[PDB]
Design an enzyme around this catalytic site. Structure first.
Site: not given
Ligand SMILES: OC[C@H]1O[C@H](O)[C@H](O)[C@@H](O)[C@@H]1O
Ligand SMILES: OC[C@H]1O[C@H](O)[C@H](O)[C@@H](O)[C@@H]1O
Ligand SMILES: [Ca+2]
Ligand SMILES: [Ca+2]
Ligand SMILES: [Mg+2]
Ligand SMILES: [Mg+2]
Ligand SMILES: [Mg+2]
Ligand SMILES: [Mg+2]
Ligand SMILES: [Mg+2]
Lengths: 565, 569
Positions: A206, A281
């Site tokens: 992420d 991501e």
């Molecule tokens: O960790 C910070 C962010 O990371 C990713 O985007 C997650 O999907 C989100 O839910 C979270 O708040």
């Protein structure tokens, strides 16, 4: 047609464990709950699952604030429960990916405790900076720069114990690692090796756009201010006040991703068996998104970065030409040999039928399944789950609590997409034996649930099943694609492959009836047979389309089976 | 053998060239381009393989906005010449087989027009020809006059000008001297038909019509009897007198403007039916989002509008910042949004924007002209693109563009001025590049005219102009007029465009738009069988016309473009 590696055309399903299945009546989803419904993935035609984080976490950001990257959150279960989940998923032929966020750790992590205490080897594990003097009241320290947190307020938090600010691009409790520190990068390889050794099939990672920020070494020892947006509607504490020039999409972040891939390639070479993957991501412009695949100097990155275009760039405001033009963006920008993927939702965004319309659920699932590459499904999309109502009182999303109030919280809250999964029409939609669910169950669970859709002739879930089954056909794994708008209201997507059946999506994305000339659709010979129709279509599966003039109702989607080219 | 093809209507695949008459050819030494200058060089269009010319406005004008402030829609500006010169131009152009289109701006007239003079005097038939409004009531300071709304002019300041004579404000979306017609007035709409009939009767082949997004503004009937304020942008860098202070919700892209355009097409269709001979056309100008741009073609209730709206995507959405994927994705936008039966067109410049090689790079000129000529539909060329003219340097002292004079100062004028793209055309290396016999020209001749001029490019072995001629000649081949088109990026650096037509030769553009070399696999290009021959190459290319491509591996330099000729599919 040569068989593809599993990750090149998998149906990939995101589980939000806290909301999937509660096995022990605490109103909280858990690993035994997942284990109990692994059969659902086989029934649905899902090949691979990824879970929102299940590692030890104080739950400030419901698992994305990780305090121990090597063990399981107690509310979800034990290491032994996770081992059981891998074992039983692998027995059922499923792949299992772990999600974690490399960008930051919980302030309750040993990493942070030691770093704050300047323990040897840990001093530089996080981004630590001195205050600036305040011209207007010298007793009030100013942060190192104007950087703004994704959850509002300053991205800098004062530590009483260390007498310095630390950087948090997310919550106060999510502390940004220093990715210029070789010991931080080594720790990431240590975490990955640990879970790959347990038998995980790979990782989702992420918040990668936020990995690296400006080096004060390049700015005369200062953290440089982000440029201002210059928009009067944002005050200095509000997300949008700044343009994140020095805090997001820095070219150095991609070198970290390329190193992760190098490590995974070496691991796959040394251990053999099925490929272990990394999916990334980042919400970024398309050219910065494509650098996650690799670069034209020959760097290789993530097996793919997630494609968020059906979240960010299409909605119920979009016409058929918008649908086609956005679908073309990934297919135009993706590198040669790249695997396309399609994401229609997640726990951070409004649910698919809420962003679009209730009468578009089947057409959207057809697009996902019929486009080349990987279909990604978020928990609930296979049954058309809608956003659940969550009161201010019942809101637990830190983003809503930090950016919003009782009148504005709905602009920010991610909770409506995190309400418990609708298994059936029993207490708490069969998610739990308890009425005490961590978020309230959506009001429509009696009308929208999996058990009901399995026992009715036509349903979103039965369409989902027919579409994942269709992906076994060579036309979908190996076929060409042709996509064009027939009007402002209707587009087509054709998959074709010489000597194999042709498959055609027709989708009226508009709120009005549309009549199209099927003579405009390449590779469509009539008569053709309806393979799947929207649940509100007049056409049933097995219906023969014989006329070149076709009237589609609002939201109506058909998959036609036609003669091979 | 090669299939017979039906020839297309002229306007569906013309090479259309924009003349800026003030800057094309000065025949009389006043440093101002003129109609006798154009007449003297009509042979240039035949030499270049141009099918059709359009001229920036040549109607009577005080020249506040160099022709776009029109004081008489029925006669010629004296600096350019006479009605007789215009009739001679049409006759000689038609004899050479060229089409001639007139440009004018329907949105507004000069404050020196008889229309405006009669309107300000509240003469019968003219009192409501323009948008006239009372001051906004100021019950707080009854002695301070307030304009009807906060609307901002495209050239800076209020869009409302006080008339002492009429004791009302008039609307001007452009200069104070450019007065907005009321397009809800049936007499204004009839006057536009009267203007078009007059020039079609003279023998014009069609019109280009300017500034259409600005035709209609909010009706006070819809806003409780006042002109509504445009919403604020909220950008801290703009005050109330500065373009950017507002979002033009009530002043631009109103759905009622398209009904005026559909009426123009109705009038033209009726004119064509009642006169026969070759179709007379209307091409529309508007800078708007893609959905609002496509409504110029028609709507899905069956309304039909302009033969096409101009496609400005190579001006607005691509530049030297763009990679090969950006090029492909922007080309796909017109093709994805255009209605069924819509004719595509491609515009690389005009007198309002930086010149094509300045917006892109000097090493990209040939590749850009190749895209223009090989894409399906109509290629639009702006005066100088056929020789790769760059923006000229224009000092504050030599700046005459009203936009720069009103919005700018010695420090900022270069942000706004359109003058760099309006410098005199480079015919040769003589005095004033052969534009004029005099060293005194209305804008300064660019400093590079000895390096970049038409006569030099006719005499050198390889040149932008010789490439331009080869490409306009290639458009007569059935593969370019009638063929299919396939476009994709091979990398971030290089894209292909293939034109194919069973039994006819295949043509392939390969263009490295990047600043780095690229090697590509020609095995990935559809309809390309090797060996193939170089038809056209960039002036800097290793490969001359005639060069045989035998290897599937092709290395292209930064900016390098090739057209390959390959066997029929
Ligand atoms: O960790 C910070 C962010 O990371 C990713 O985007 C997650 O999907 C989100 O839910 C979270 O708040
Ligand atoms: O008439 C107002 C404007 O109309 C057109 O856009 C012209 O091309 C421009 O030069 C002029 O200033
Ligand atoms: Ca970071
Ligand atoms: Ca107007
Ligand atoms: Mg539980
Ligand atoms: Mg580098
Ligand atoms: Mg002259
Ligand atoms: Mg102010
Ligand atoms: Mg401008």
């Amino acid at each position: 047609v040569i068989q593809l590696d599993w990750w090149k055309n998998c149906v990939l399903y995101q589980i939000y464990p806290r909301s999937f299945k509660d096995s022990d009546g605490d109103g909280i989803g858990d690993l035994k709950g997942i284990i109990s419904e692994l059969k659902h993935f086989v029934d649905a035609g899902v090949d691979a699952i990824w879970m929102s984080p299940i590692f030890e976490s104080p739950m400030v950001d419901f698992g994305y604030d990780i305090s121990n990257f090597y063990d399981i959150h107690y509310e979800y279960g034990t290491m032994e429960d996770f081992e059981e989940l891998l074992d039983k998923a692998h027995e059922l032929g499923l792949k299992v990916l772990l999600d974690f966020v490399p960008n930051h750790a919980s302030n309750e992590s040993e990493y942070f405790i030691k770093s704050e205490a300047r323990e040897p080897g840990y001093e530089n594990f996080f981004i630590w900076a001195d205050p600036l003097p305040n011209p207007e009241n010298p007793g009030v320290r100013l942060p190192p720069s104007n950087w703004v947190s994704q959850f509002g307020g300053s991205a800098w938090e004062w530590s009483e114990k260390r007498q310095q600010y630390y950087l948090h691009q997310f919550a106060i409790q999510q502390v940004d690692f220093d990715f210029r520190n070789p010991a931080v990068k080594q720790e990431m390889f240590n975490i990955m090796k640990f879970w790959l050794d347990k038998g995980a099939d790979g990782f989702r990672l992420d918040a990668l756009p936020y990995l690296i920020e400006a080096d004060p070494a390049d700015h005369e020892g200062r953290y440089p201010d982000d440029p201002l947006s210059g928009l009067t509607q944002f005050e200095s504490h509000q997300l949008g006040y700044t343009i994140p020039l020095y805090t997001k999409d820095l070219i150095e972040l991609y070198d970290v991703v390329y190193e992760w891939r190098e490590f995974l390639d070496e691991y796959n070479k040394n251990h053999g068996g099925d490929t272990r993957v990394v999916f990334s991501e980042g919400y970024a412009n398309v050219s910065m998104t494509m650098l996650y695949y690799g670069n034209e100097d020959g760097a290789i990155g993530a097996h793919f970065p997630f494609n968020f275009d059906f979240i960010t760039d299409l909605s119920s405001k979009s016409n058929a030409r918008d649908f086609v033009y956005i679908i073309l963006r990934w297919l135009t920008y993706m590198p040669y040999g790249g695997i396309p993927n399609w994401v229609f939702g997640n726990h951070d965004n409004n649910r698919m039928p809420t962003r679009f319309r209730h009468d578009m659920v089947d057409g959207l699932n057809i697009i996902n399944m019929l486009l080349p590459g990987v279909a990604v499904t978020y928990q609930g999309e296979e049954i058309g789950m809608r956003d659940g109502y969550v009161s201010w009182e019942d809101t637990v999303d830190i983003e809503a609590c930090n950016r919003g109030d009782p009148d504005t919280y709905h602009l920010y809250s991610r909770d409506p997409a995190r309400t418990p999964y609708h298994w059936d029409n029993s207490t708490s939609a069969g998610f739990s034996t308890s009425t005490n669910t961590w978020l309230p169950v959506a009001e429509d669970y009696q009308e929208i649930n999996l058990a009901k859709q399995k026992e009715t002739a036509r349903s979103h879930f039965k369409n989902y099943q027919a579409l994942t089954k269709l992906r076994k056909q060579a036309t979908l794994s190996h076929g060409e694609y042709d996509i064009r708008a027939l009007s402002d209201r209707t587009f087509y997507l054709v998959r074709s492959l010489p000597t194999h059946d042709t498959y055609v999506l027709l989708f009226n994305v508009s709120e009005r009836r549309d009549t199209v000339d099927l003579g405009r659709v390449p590779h469509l010979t009539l008569p053709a047979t309806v393979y799947v129709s929207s649940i509100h279509s007049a056409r049933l599966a097995g219906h023969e389309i014989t006329s070149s003039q076709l009237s589609l109702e609002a939201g109506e989607a058909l998959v036609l089976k036609a003669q091979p080219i």
